[PDB]
């Protein structure tokens, strides 16, 4: 199959400023009839995909004239002269020149803002979950930017990579930050064999991680 | 005028079958191709193939040859997608699309969510999360099925610093967490309660957050 490579996968934008997305293919998309079947789609949050450009540069019915598509051969580009809130979502380039139709991986447009470090809060297993035989240790890493962050767990100074499940929110519509929740699930017996539990937030805003601990005693 | 409306959400168990529809309006149905595309949750797009609306001949890509069947009921301007012997990995939103002259995927349906699970309806266990100018508290909603659950704080009175996170599968069931941030003068001097609803099990729980 033809491999479609979109660069970058996440593009930080500013309302009022221009954005650009690259799409390279593993083989030529110039077809037999002299046409190039390279298209672009947009999929906004919670909505189905929606046609933007076809035949490399032709805007579809009712698409804002500020969307520009160009290229030829194996290199293509989608530019947005001035970005708006309506333009936020996931953009995919896809080809129809060769069977089977293939899509790029998608490029998500997020809003750029100032770097904000995460507020970490660690919580031990409740008395209720414990009486039932369970042990879940939770850590929240809230309102940080950008989205990239690493979360580390340690039981009595020693790391534990297995039994950790994470979840992330979408970009906040007000402050433009992200928040993450990380849960460490253990058995009740295995929770009562260690005293100190720690959650660490490694984010670019510091050369040192934001460490939060609590001891079962 | 050109619209494609798909059938509603489906919850099925492994080994069962499902048949979803796409009714087209605004044009002469047998004039253009109907295409099928899969999107697994939080992932990209994958073309499953198409069907010829004049002859009724289907074309399937490599990964959808076997358990999948595309069909028509041309008199009702409708195309169907049937998946047999359902498996977990079939969980996704399926889209129908109609071709134009220069593009195969031009007009899109709203999508049909198919979730495949051997889980039975189960209410969640709701646990308060108390820390071991501001203070952050929370609630853990663990082991429920099916989605969704609604989480609120002080019956909606608290909604400023609220983060309710996307649920995650842990052993065939769903688990989720919510966090709230309030002034240090407000808790524990006053009560803070998380309200958790799960319509599928007719459950509604209130959990006060106490220091611990």
């Amino acid at each position: 199959d033809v491999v479609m490579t979109q660069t970058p996968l996440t593009l930080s934008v500013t309302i009022g400023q221009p954005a650009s997305i690259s799409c390279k293919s593993s083989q030529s998309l110039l077809d037999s009839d002299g046409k190039t079947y390279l298209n672009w789609l947009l999929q906004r949050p919670g909505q189905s995909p929606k046609r933007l450009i076809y035949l490399v540069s032709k805007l579809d019915s009712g698409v804002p004239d500020r969307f520009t598509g160009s290229g030829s051969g194996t290199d293509f580009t989608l530019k947005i002269s001035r970005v708006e809130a309506e333009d936020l979502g996931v953009y995919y380039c896809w080809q129809g020149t060769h069977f089977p139709l293939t899509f790029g991986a998608g490029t998500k447009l997020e809003l750029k803002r100032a770097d904000a470090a995460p507020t970490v809060s660690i919580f031990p297993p409740s008395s209720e979950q414990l009486t039932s035989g369970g042990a879940s240790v939770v850590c929240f890493l809230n309102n940080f930017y950008p989205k990239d962050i690493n979360v580390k767990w340690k039981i009595d100074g020693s790391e534990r990579q297995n039994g950790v499940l994470n979840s992330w929110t979408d970009q906040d519509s007000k402050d433009s930050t992200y928040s993450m929740s990380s849960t460490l699930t253990l058995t009740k017996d295995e929770y009562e064999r260690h005293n100190s539990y720690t959650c660490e937030a490694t984010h670019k805003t510091s050369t040192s991680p934001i460490v939060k601990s609590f001891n079962r005693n | 005028q050109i619209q494609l409306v798909q059938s509603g959400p489906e919850l099925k168990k492994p080994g069962e079958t499902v048949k979803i529809s796409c009714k087209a309006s605004g044009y002469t149905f047998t004039d253009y191709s109907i295409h099928w595309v899969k999107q697994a949750p939080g992932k990209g797009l994958k073309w499953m193939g198409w069907i010829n609306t004049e002859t009724g001949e289907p074309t399937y890509t490599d990964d959808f040859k076997g358990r999948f069947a595309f069909s028509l009921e041309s008199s009702a301007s409708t195309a169907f997608l049937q998946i047999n012997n359902l498996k977990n990995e079939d969980t996704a939103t399926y889209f129908c699309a109609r071709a134009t002259t220069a593009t195969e995927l031009a007009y899109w349906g709203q999508g049909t969510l198919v979730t495949v699970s051997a889980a039975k309806t189960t209410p969640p266990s709701v646990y308060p999360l108390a820390p071991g100018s501001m203070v952050t508290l929370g609630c853990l909603v663990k082991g429920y099925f099916p989605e969704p659950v609604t989480v609120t704080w002080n019956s909606g009175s608290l909604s400023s610093g609220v983060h309710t996170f996307p649920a995650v599968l842990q052993s065939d069931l769903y688990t989720l967490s919510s966090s709230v941030t309030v002034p240090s003068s407000t808790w524990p001097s006053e009560t803070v309660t998380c309200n958790v609803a799960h319509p599928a099990s007719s459950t509604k729980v209130d959990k006060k957050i106490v220091p611990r």
């Binding site: 139709l101 | 191709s33 198409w50 004049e54 071709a99 593009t103």
Partner: peptide, 9 residues
């Protein structure tokens, strides 16, 4: 009347 990928009708 229809190509390998279904274009057009």
């Amino acid at each position: 009347a229809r190509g390998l990928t279904g274009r057009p009708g």
